[PDB]
Amino acid sequence: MKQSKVFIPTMRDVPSEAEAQSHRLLLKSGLIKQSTSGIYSYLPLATRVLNNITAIVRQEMERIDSVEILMPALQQAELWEESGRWGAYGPELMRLQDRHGRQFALGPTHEELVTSIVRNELKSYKQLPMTLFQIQSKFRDEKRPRFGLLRGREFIMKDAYSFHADEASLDQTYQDMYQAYSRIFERVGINARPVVADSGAIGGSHTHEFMALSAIGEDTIVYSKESDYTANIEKAEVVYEPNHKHSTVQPLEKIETPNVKTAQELADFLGRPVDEIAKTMIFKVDGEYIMVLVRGHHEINDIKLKSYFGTDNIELATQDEIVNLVSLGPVIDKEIKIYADNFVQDLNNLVVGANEDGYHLINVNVGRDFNVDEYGDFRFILEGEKLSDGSGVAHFAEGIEVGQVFKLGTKYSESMNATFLDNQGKAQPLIMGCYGIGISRTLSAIVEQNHDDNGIVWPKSVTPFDLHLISINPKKDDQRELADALYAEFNTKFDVLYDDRQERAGVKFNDADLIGLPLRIVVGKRASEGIVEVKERLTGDSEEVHIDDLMTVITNKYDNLK
Amino acid sequence: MKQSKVFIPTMRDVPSEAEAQSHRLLLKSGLIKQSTSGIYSYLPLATRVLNNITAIVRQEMERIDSVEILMPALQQAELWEESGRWGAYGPELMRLQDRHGRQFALGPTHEELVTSIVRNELKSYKQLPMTLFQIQSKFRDEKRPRFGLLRGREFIMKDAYSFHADEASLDQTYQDMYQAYSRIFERVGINARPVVADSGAIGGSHTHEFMALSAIGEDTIVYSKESDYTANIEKAEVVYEPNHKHSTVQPLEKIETPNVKTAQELADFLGRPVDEIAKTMIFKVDGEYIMVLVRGHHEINDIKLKSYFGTDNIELATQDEIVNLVSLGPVIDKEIKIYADNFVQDLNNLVVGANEDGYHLINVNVGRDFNVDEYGDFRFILEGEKLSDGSGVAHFAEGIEVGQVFKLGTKYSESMNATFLDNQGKAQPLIMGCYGIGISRTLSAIVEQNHDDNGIVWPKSVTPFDLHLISINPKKDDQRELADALYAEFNTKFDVLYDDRQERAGVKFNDADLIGLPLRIVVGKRASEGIVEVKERLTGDSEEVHIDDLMTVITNKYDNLK
Numbered sequence A, B: 001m002k003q004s005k006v007f008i009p010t011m012r013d014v015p016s017e018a019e020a021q022s023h024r025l026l027l028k029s030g031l032i033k034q035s036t037s038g039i040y041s042y043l044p045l046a047t048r049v050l051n052n053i054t055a056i057v058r059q060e061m062e063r064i065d066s067v068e069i070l071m072p073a074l075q076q077a078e079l080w081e082e083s084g085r086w087g088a089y090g091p092e093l094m095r096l097q098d099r100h101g102r103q104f105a106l107g108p109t110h111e112e113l114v115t116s117i118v119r120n121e122l123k124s125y126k127q128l129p130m131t132l133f134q135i136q137s138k139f140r141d142e143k144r145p146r147f148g149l150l151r152g153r154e155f156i157m158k159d160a161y162s163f164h165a166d167e168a169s170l171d172q173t174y175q176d177m178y179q180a181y182s183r184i185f186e187r188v189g190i191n192a193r194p195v196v197a198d199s200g201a202i203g204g205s206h207t208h209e210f211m212a213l214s215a216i217g218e219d220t221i222v223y224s225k226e227s228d229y230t231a232n233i234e235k236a237e238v239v240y241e242p243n244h245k246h247s248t249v250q251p252l253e254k255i256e257t258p259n260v261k262t263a264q265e266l267a268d269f270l271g272r273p274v275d276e277i278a279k280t281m282i283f284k285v286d287g288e289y290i291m292v293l294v295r296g297h298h299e300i301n302d303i304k305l306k307s308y309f310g311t312d313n314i315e316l317a318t319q320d321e322i323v324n325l326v327s328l329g330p331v332i333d334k335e336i337k338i339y340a341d342n343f344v345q346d347l348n349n350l351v352v353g354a355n356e357d358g359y360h361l362i363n364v365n366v367g368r369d370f371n372v373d374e375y376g377d378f379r380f381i382l383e384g385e386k387l388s389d390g391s392g393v394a395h396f397a398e399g400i401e402v403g404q405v406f407k408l409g410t411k412y413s414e415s416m417n418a419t420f421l422d423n424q425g426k427a428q429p430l431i432m433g434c435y436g437i438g439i440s441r442t443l444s445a446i447v448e449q450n451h452d453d454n455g456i457v458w459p460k461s462v463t464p465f466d467l468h469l470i471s472i473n474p475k476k477d478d479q480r481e482l483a484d485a486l487y488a489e490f491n492t493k494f495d496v497l498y499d500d501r502q503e504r505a506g507v508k509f510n511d512a513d514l515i516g517l518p519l520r521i522v523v524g525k526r527a528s529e530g531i532v533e534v535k536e537r538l539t540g541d542s543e544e545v546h547i548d549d550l551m552t553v554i555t556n557k558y559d560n561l562k
């Protein structure tokens, strides 16, 4: 393509709104444009990168016999009522009515839709297993869209769904997808790690998140240097090995604590270490209010709470609810269940809130002053603590969730009545797997890991064009004519972006750095001599090359790119 | 792909609901599945055909420097308010609210969205022209979804938009698109014709519809055998050359006409020819009621009415409105404007309704009994009539509108303030073109023209697989082992669908006819001898071939397919 015919609205200055480097760079390089909050258009160069990503995805899917389909965004509410998800989800599910008052969801995902395709069509065990996937735009009314393509409200997902006669078949396809995903991410230029993920409040089947290792990552991975242990910090179990810090039991005193809000402020006010303070939060779980206690150096992990209680309906109590009910503390007259993290047992003579502003309690002891109804693992692991598998020490790394693989089992097939006749000839619900890659999120993740201060540095596998051909001054006949000839010579074997614009060299080069193609061929002053400059985007190395050498010099350099 | 791993839910019996052969065949062959009215899922084989179609489209777009983008389905209402289309369109525009009460449209098309991308980015004449396209799913709440993919509510369109400094530039890109479209349709196996289309009520710029010539087609093309004249019957002008049929003027009589509703019934009741009767319809146009008169052998063309009056707000009057106001006729006491088709002037002594059930008027004469306020071309041309260009006689052919090219001009750029600095350095609105192909409709059109009674007969260019490899009985080691070997040999150069199923030959062959791959390789009883049968889907020709000959026999046959 001639660059004069390609829409690439490069920016001079990026807004301070934009925080993530991928978002800033995708804006600055003219690759995306925001329509409104979390809704973007993919401009020409981004679309070419998307096409390269999806081609790779399609190859890896076909390699494991995952077969492409395309399902609708408009999904009738009756389908979501069959599964029970219509009522289970709130404002994140985008909903609408058609001209006859019939209700629809815009698809956030397609479990019901695919199940509706397959039911009474996958009739026999002889047709199983079956794996289907699409690359399609999903809709989720995210509470907080942010970081550009990392969290949009309309986004591209590759979603796959597999159907099985038994657990062993599912296990096989799960493994195939796991391995395919690893290959996908490596091929597109992402350093990713699969990590054990939380299976939800109610379920317990296996699931792995694929995490692009990057500092902007909102997820934390817990990993071993000794074993292959890798878990999301939400999931990572803390094993409690008793190590008591008990001192001689003292009597309960209420004390004045002016302007003290936080646990660390309290610690500093009392001259005690923060770990000796116990914090109290109030949660509402399936209707009823509870107390959860953790040590001052720890934080409550509400994914663990959800899994512990076996419910998703867990939220913190509001200011009003806390007032109506009751710095908070566990010494209260009301009949309320009190839960404590296991590591609270290493202390006695607790420091807690008084349920009375300006006051805290000291020397509070369990059994005497209040009772803990149940102990458990309700917190995040800390870096340095012993891992649950006994392998060694916990290390953290940040991560972007670029994909996930799930064993679903029979949830949808039982609720929506999707059965097959087994080996014995009796009706059984389809065993399902499901697997997803954030395609637009992955595009951003590629950028996060493949850039410098001057712009994007696209991997060879996904770069929108292979070579940037640049004439310094096309008013000069020798430059223009040479560059024209080179375009013709190179644009058969390669995809060439030819910067043919009547535009100052400075802006062409600036644009070229932002766009980030791996190799640059500059035609300038030495065009008469048949000499051009070849520049590498990654290293910034530059060398002069005569045109008769150019095909082999470029071919060799291209072949040796990562 | 092994067919055991591909979801292809072939049917025994198609519902009587399904009317169009493409719809019936796409259902029966396991290519689409209806989710709800006008909303389909594309199953594996259809998705492969879609991918082949879009690849061809992408090549032809790149050939004319049309550059791919991807714009969102969710479009904020504020954008549609800028253009005025939010208020101009009714229930066909699908609308919704997000979780903060902000209003959106699901995109039925993207004029506003693309204009919002380009505005203040295409800043100078030096950047023009620019052409952008996407392949993306559109949403229209069609009053009457029908004929499967021919009229859905969610459908795939390729939509392109071009931006220009002057009319000559637009004319150039319009021509490029016109030519590209012709190539696209020929390559995908469609016999199509470009035809002059109606430019809307208000506009007068050029537009051509691309019509797939097929009997299920709801459009009628008017064409010359002498010239290149081709117009949609909605557009095709009728030139009135006077040819009076006048008889001696007679006095107005009201007559009894029991059980006579239609013009033909009236003609038969009176023993007169139907062309001597004049029909009267009441229309509401921009608020006010009018009468339109046509001869009994003619029909009112309300696209012509819309163009004549320069408004889209034209509808027939309801039963109540007709009652409140007034077989209908033009002899009425009320002050109402009466319009007549030009060919009414060839008659005198008109036969009309009486505005009184059970009665009609005879010997009604213009000037005496009522006045015609204006004469015009308000009807459809008939087959046999002289064409507007004087080239010769009108012939009809049926057609499916598979695409359209439009000159838009400055409608959106003026309403949405999208300007560029011209040669003189002064702000001017962008001159726009827009161009669309119904991708999913085209898929159906391919089927309509490429099938027989036993199933689909896919053109080589779009067939989901190239060769159907079929083992008659895979329990036989020699058949299975031979077919396995052939799969490996052929599935590098070709895409092979390998029917490896444990399934009776009869159903394999039936399935194979429905699926419609151009060449079939059958491995059966003569597998031990290294002999297979090669069968052509189009002709039904069959011949025996030894395996050492097979690569060249298949390659030659494949190369000689259309």
Ligand SMILES: Nc1ncnc2c1ncn2[C@@H]1O[C@H](COP(=O)(O)OP(=O)(O)NP(=O)(O)O)[C@@H](O)[C@H]1O
Pocket: A109, A140, A142, A149, A150, A151, A152, A153, A155, A156, A157, A401, A402, A403, A404, A436, A437, A438, A439, A440, A441, A442
């Ligand atoms: N709002 C979004 N924008 C872009 N990509 C997304 C979004 N939500 C999910 N994805 C991607 O789609 C994949 C599968 O979706 P899913 O597992 O439902 O995401 P999720 O668990 O809701 N992730 P998150 O919302 O980031 O906690 C994820 O691994 C992401 O890569």
Ligand SMILES: Nc1ncnc2c1ncn2[C@@H]1O[C@H](COP(=O)(O)OP(=O)(O)NP(=O)(O)O)[C@@H](O)[C@H]1O
Pocket: B109, B140, B142, B149, B150, B151, B152, B153, B155, B156, B157, B401, B402, B403, B404, B436, B437, B438, B439, B440, B441, B442
């Ligand atoms: N409801 C639909 N289902 C499938 N394809 C469609 C539909 N509407 C339009 N298309 C296709 O999209 C192309 C461009 O859209 P457009 O010109 O807006 O269609 P349109 O004039 O509304 N056609 P119609 O509704 O059939 O009179 C058309 O040429 C069709 O091929």
Ligand SMILES: O=C(C[C@@H]1CCCCN1)Cn1cnc2cc(Cl)c(F)cc2c1=O
Pocket: A085, A089, A092, A093, A094, A108, A109, A110, A111, A140, A141, A158, A159, A160, A404, A434, A435, A436, A437
């Ligand atoms: O979508 C998944 C899991 C996998 C991911 C890969 C493809 C198959 N699905 C999980 N999830 C997340 N957010 C959701 C949001 C809404 Cl509004 C919803 F209604 C449903 C879901 C929902 O189910």
Ligand SMILES: O=C(C[C@@H]1CCCCN1)Cn1cnc2cc(Cl)c(F)cc2c1=O
Pocket: B085, B089, B092, B093, B094, B108, B109, B110, B111, B140, B141, B158, B159, B160, B404, B434, B435, B436, B437
């Ligand atoms: O879409 C087009 C014309 C071209 C076709 C090719 C791509 C660019 N657009 C015409 N049209 C048709 N039906 C519509 C329906 C609704 Cl609900 C709407 F709001 C708008 C339109 C509308 O504008």
Ligand SMILES: [Mg+2]
Pocket: none
């Ligand atoms: Mg989410």
Ligand SMILES: [Mg+2]
Pocket: A401, A404
């Ligand atoms: Mg997830």
Ligand SMILES: [Mg+2]
Pocket: none
């Ligand atoms: Mg329409």
Ligand SMILES: [Mg+2]
Pocket: B401, B404
């Ligand atoms: Mg049209």
